Enzyme design. Structure first.
Site, PDB file in Angstrom:
ATOM      1  N   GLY A   1      -0.066  25.447-112.594  1.00  0.00           N
ATOM      2  CA  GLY A   1       0.007  24.257-111.763  1.00  0.00           C
ATOM      3  C   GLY A   1      -1.133  23.273-111.979  1.00  0.00           C
ATOM      4  O   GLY A   1      -2.029  23.493-112.796  1.00  0.00           O
TER       5      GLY A   1
ATOM      6  N   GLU B   1     -18.439  45.987-114.714  1.00  0.00           N
ATOM      7  CA  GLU B   1     -19.422  46.857-114.083  1.00  0.00           C
ATOM      8  C   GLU B   1     -19.851  46.296-112.712  1.00  0.00           C
ATOM      9  O   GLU B   1     -20.014  47.039-111.742  1.00  0.00           O
ATOM     10  CB  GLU B   1     -20.622  47.033-115.017  1.00  0.00           C
ATOM     11  CG  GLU B   1     -21.516  48.171-114.629  1.00  0.00           C
ATOM     12  CD  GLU B   1     -22.613  48.372-115.632  1.00  0.00           C
ATOM     13  OE1 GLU B   1     -22.304  48.762-116.782  1.00  0.00           O
ATOM     14  OE2 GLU B   1     -23.773  48.094-115.280  1.00  0.00           O
TER      15      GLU B   1
END
Ligand SMILES: *[C@H]1CC(=O)C/C(C)=C\C=C\C(=O)O[C@H]([C@H](O)NC(=O)/C=C\C=C\C)C/C(C)=C/[C@@H]2CC(=C)C[C@H](C1)O2
Ligand SMILES: Nc1nc2c(ncn2[C@@H]2O[C@H](COP(=O)(O)OP(=O)(O)OP(=O)(O)O)[C@@H](O)[C@H]2O)c(=O)[nH]1
Ligand SMILES: Nc1nc2c(ncn2[C@@H]2O[C@H](COP(=O)(O)OP(=O)(O)O)[C@@H](O)[C@H]2O)c(=O)[nH]1
Ligand SMILES: N[C@@H](Cc1ccc(O)cc1)C(=O)O
Ligand SMILES: [Ca+2]
Ligand SMILES: [Mg+2]
Ligand SMILES: [Mg+2]
Lengths: 440, 69, 431
Positions: free
Chosen positions: A10, A254
């Site tokens: 969009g 992480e």
């Protein structure tokens, strides 16, 4: 190695994509024609930047990206603009008629006509990856396509790629730049539908960005161009660990381990510094201490809420540029002995730090000063739920009278879908209360 | 211990497959329900419009019978 | 979605239609021959929304002209920009409708409607992605009112998923052609309630009062009224014709403006409206525009918005001005007028700025309100209707065409229901 595929959905998703990919090219030394002189392996490789760019034998560095919109006029500007050679035409996908600010049209009536083509194009990108890590999906909450088509696409990606990771950058509505009265309906509908399909979502409150532009960059009346340049710096901070190497560099995955304590609790708060004009930055070096302090100033948050009135479940600091651990540790110690930083009782309180040594970059003609060091904090705070509360209340006001609901029902939706979505949001708000309560 | 190791991984596989199957089925149900709903909304509208045509015929018939006077 | 197909029916419909095309052609730099002679690329960017492009770089209005008598359309053809219209798009009968809704809707109009539909189909089939339709007509006559609402029904049957928009001119005894106008209007509103998505209520009562009271025109002519109408129609279509973010197509406009499907009758407004004499004393500024556009005197429907509440509002500014100032003034006006916006639709006033001003003004503003005070217009019509219907005045004109009284009763009841529905939402609260 581990490739990442970006999907820009969009108008907001596309225009933010434009800004991000332009910025990435500048950070990596890629020209508008896709050439990259510094890259000595022609036609491929496993450098860090290859997570985001594939390469052709003719030396073109091509974004691993699909741009999709249900009408053509925004993507047409990409096709005809400065970076038109960067993208293969098949990566830029448009229909003829948009979703008219209606989730139902984006997910069903119009979306369904183009979803298979979009998946086919994404598959073509995926087939070129040797170790695909996942997807990054950029979209508004408020638009019909950004809300409804994104949801449909996320559901389909779960089916076709299983639990391969999907991260979102989601644009949360603000009255200063919103274009539809029904944005709260669209936001709740898409948040409900996407919740089980997304691993991590970074909300960007347009109002927060609007006020940062006004206040810190002295922009009288920010346009999307102003907002998107700031947003791209923040997205770049978050993805830099994927695109650059380095001894002190810590992978976004992480940080995600620490940021997501339960599957639904997956909405980090980003805070970025420094946002400063060239005029103000001149002859003024902002230190590690100064930019770190700024991350605990709520005015610099990308979502309006007050973490001083909530609890932390994680704090991560993503530094870039001229930064060493000694100075970070010192700044953190100072902040500890001075700030409203209370953790829940079930999480460790240590801040998680990453440093990427490649200095920040700015786009020519922009508003941000070029600085030697910057930082993005990602925190998991119960305060982020205030954003849901504000949207949920606007939803309730209109839904109580069923205002505008006939537009959705007309496209085949049922009131049952509205109440299901709103109940899920009520449960999410309760989830955020519950995690903050002390252990028995 | 080896038997347990095998059970853990087959469990992981089973839950991922079940997640996919459930997502696929839910989406199929939603798209079918939506299609049926929108079509029924359109049909109702056309039915009303067609009634109007019926009524218009009735009016013109009524004029013609009163002109047979 | 991209192309709009325009239809203009009847005398009023063709007269205001022709002015609309004159005005927007000038704005887009298109001359009477259909050739472009403008200076700004903004003029052409979305030109195809309203114009077909032909051989020779010519722009031809996607416009269909309909009437049951030849007179007005002959005058259009002879008028300015008359040669710009596609000659095959003139569809007209000879018998007229005699200011009789029944003749327009059930009789004469019915005999002609298929040939009109043939032209609509030809225009529509050549569209890349048809948005929908806009119709200009009066509700007080026979053709525009009766045949126009017939056309609406037939078009809806063939294009049920496209948006139907009307500019509907409401009758007033201050500008009155015949005694049966209240009948024709009530029968027409009956159709509009059921079969359009959005209707601009262009009220002859309001136009007359603006001309007489504000512009000090002692004897306003239809020309004077139509100048206001075309300024308004220009204004409310700027979001469709020029690049922009807000309400850029007919469906997005409807989704923002229509919270309940029957409540789709808009109060349009225009600023500035100040006499040349008073302009000596009053500056044309953004705050002046903002205060004017929210005042009853500037509304094109004769209703006072401070007698009701706004469900939704679009405010469109035109010309060179400070975006910051517009935003501040729009916030200020909502603050000062807080009670008059329903509390249960948050952020229900949307604002846009278009860089291109109307001809002859440095700046202007156009107001589109979905206000429950529009009930004042419908009540005015209803009161005139009932006065005649209780004594069955002139019914034989309608029953003579084959209608029965019951149809009058039903239109009356549907229009009275519409009023009650506005009142319900006006009275609603968040708590
Ligand atoms: C129609 C022009 C026409 O034929 C008559 C002429 C040449 C001018 C009419 C001007 C007009 O009616 O002015 C209007 C207000 O009186 N003007 C102001 O109030 C100006 C300043 C106020 C300061 C406080 C507004 C009007 C309806 C203009 C429209 C705009 C448009 C779309 C074209 C139309 C041309 O004039
Ligand atoms: N930050 C930012 N927000 C945008 C941008 N464009 C649109 N928005 C916001 O996005 C929301 C509107 O949704 P859009 O992305 O324009 O709509 P869409 O996805 O194209 O959906 P439809 O047009 O309804 O098919 C509003 O909240 C806008 O303020 C942009 O470039 N940057
Ligand atoms: N504003 C305006 N109203 C008109 C015009 N011509 C006719 N009317 C109004 O339209 C109504 C009469 O309908 P008309 O269009 O003449 O009938 P038709 O030819 O059968 O459609 C009356 O209320 C008139 O005041 C015009 O040029 N401008
Ligand atoms: N008290 C719950 C809080 C919780 C919140 C959200 C969840 O999805 C699950 C649990 C717990 O810590 O176990
Ligand atoms: Ca290489
Ligand atoms: Mg769009
Ligand atoms: Mg007449």
């Amino acid at each position: 190695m581990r490739e990442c595929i970006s999907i820009h959905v969009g108008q907001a998703g596309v225009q933010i994509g434009n800004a991000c990919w332009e910025l990435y090219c500048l950070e990596h030394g890629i020209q508008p024609d896709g050439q990259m002189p510094s890259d000595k392996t022609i036609g491929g490789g496993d450098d860090s930047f290859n997570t985001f760019f594939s390469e052709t034998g003719a030396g073109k560095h091509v974004p691993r990206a699909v741009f999709v919109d249900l009408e053509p006029t925004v993507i047409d500007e990409v096709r005809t603009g400065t970076y038109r050679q960067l993208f293969h035409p098949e990566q830029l996908i448009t229909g003829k008629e948009d979703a008219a600010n209606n989730y139902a049209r984006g997910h069903y009536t119009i979306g369904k006509e183009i979803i298979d083509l979009v998946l086919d194009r994404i598959r073509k990108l995926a087939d070129q990856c040797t170790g695909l890590q996942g997807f990054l999906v950029f979209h508004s909450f408020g638009g019909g396509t950004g809300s409804g088509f994104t949801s449909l696409l996320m559901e389909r990606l779960s089916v076709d790629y299983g639990k391969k990771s999907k991260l979102e950058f989601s644009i949360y509505p603000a009255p200063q730049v919103s274009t539809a009265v029904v944005e709260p309906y669209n936001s709740i509908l898409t948040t409900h539908t996407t919740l089980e399909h997304s691993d991590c979502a970074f909300m960007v409150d347009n109002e927060a960005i609007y006020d940062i532009c006004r206040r810190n960059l002295d922009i009288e009346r920010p346009t999307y161009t102003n907002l998107n340049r700031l947003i791209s710096q923040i997205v770049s901070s978050i993805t830099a660990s994927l695109r650059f190497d380095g001894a002190l560099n810590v992978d976004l995955t992480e940080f995600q381990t620490n940021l997501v304590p339960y599957p639904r609790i997956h909405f980090p708060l980003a805070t970025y510094a420094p946002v400063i004009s060239a005029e103000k930055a001149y002859h003024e070096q902002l230190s590690v201490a100064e930019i770190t302090n700024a991350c605990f100033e709520p005015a610099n948050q990308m979502v309006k809420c007050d973490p001083r009135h909530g609890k932390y479940m994680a704090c991560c600091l993503l530094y870039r540029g001229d930064v060493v651990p000694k100075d970070v540790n010192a700044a953190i110690a100072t902040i500890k002995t001075k700030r409203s930083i209370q953790f829940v009782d079930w999480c460790p309180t240590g801040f998680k730090v990453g440093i990427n040594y490649q200095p920040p970059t700015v786009v020519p003609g922009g508003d941000l000063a070029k600085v030697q060091r910057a930082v993005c904090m990602l925190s998991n705070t119960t305060a982020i739920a205030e954003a849901w509360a504000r949207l949920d209340h606007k939803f309730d006001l209109m839904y109580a009278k069923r205002a505008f609901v006939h537009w959705y029902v007309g496209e085949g939706m049922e009131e049952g879908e509205f109440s299901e979505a709103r109940e899920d949001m009520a449960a999410l708000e309760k989830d955020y209360e519950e995690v903050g309560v002390d252990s028995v | 211990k080896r038997e347990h190791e095998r059970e853990v991984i087959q469990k992981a596989i089973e839950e991922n497959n079940n997640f996919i199957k459930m997502a696929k089925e839910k989406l199929a149900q939603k798209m079918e329900s939506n299609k049926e709903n929108r079509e029924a909304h359109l049909a109702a509208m056309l039915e009303r419009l067609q009634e109007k045509d019926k009524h218009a015929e009735e009016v013109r018939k009524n004029k013609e019978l009163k002109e047979e006077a | 979605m991209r192309e709009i197909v325009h239809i203009q029916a009847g005398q009023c419909g063709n007269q205001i239609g022709a002015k609309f095309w004159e005005v927007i052609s000038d704005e887009h730099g298109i001359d009477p021959t259909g050739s472009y002679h403008g200076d700004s690329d903004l003029q052409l960017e979305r030109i195809n929304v309203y114009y077909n492009e032909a051989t020779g770089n010519k722009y031809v209005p996607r416009a269909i002209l309909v009437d049951l008598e030849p007179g007005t359309m002959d005058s259009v053809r002879s008028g300015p920009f008359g040669q710009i219209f596609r000659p095959d798009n003139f569809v007209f009968g000879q018998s007229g409708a005699g200011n009789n809704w029944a003749k327009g809707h059930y009789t004469e109009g019915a005999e002609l409607v298929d040939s009109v539909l043939d032209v609509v189909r030809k225009e529509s089939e050549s569209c890349d992605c048809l948005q929908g339709f806009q119709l200009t007509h009066s509700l007080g006559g026979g053709t525009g009112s009766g045949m126009g609402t017939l056309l609406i029904s037939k078009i809806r049957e063939e294009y049920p998923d496209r948006i139907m928009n009307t500019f509907s001119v409401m009758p007033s005894p201050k500008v009155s052609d015949t005694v049966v106008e209240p009948y024709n209007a009530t029968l027409s509103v009956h159709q509009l309630v059921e079969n359009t998505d959005e209707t601009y209520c262009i009220d002859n009562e309001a136009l007359y009062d603006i001309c007489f009271r504000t512009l000090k025109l002692t004897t306003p002519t239809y020309g004077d009224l139509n100048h206001l109408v075309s300024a308004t129609m220009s204004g409310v279509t700027t979001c469709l014709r020029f690049p922009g973010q807000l309400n850029a197509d007919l469906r997005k406009l409807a989704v923002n403006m229509v919270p309940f499907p029957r409540l789709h009758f808009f109060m349009p407004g225009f600023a500035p409206l100040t006499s040349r004499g008073s302009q000596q004393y009053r500056a044309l500024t953004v705050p002046e525009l903002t205060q004017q556009m929210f005042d009853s005197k500037n509304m094109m429907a004769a209703c006072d918005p401070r007698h009701g509440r706004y469900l939704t509002v679009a405010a469109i500014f035109r010309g060179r001005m400070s975006m910051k100032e517009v935003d501040e003034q729009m916030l200020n006006v909502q603050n000062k007028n807080s009670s008059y916006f329903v509390e249960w639709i948050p952020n229900n006033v949307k604002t846009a700025v278009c860089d291109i001003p109307p001809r002859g003004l440095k700046m202007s503003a156009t107001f589109i309100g979905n206000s429950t005070a529009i009930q004042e217009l419908f009540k005015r019509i209803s009161e005139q209707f009932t006065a005649m219907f209780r004594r069955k005045a002139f019914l034989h004109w309608y029953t003579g065409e084959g209608m029965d009284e019951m149809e009058f009763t039903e239109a009356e009841s549907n229009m009275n229901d519409l009023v009650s529905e506005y009142q319900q939402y006006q009275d609603a609260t968040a708590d």
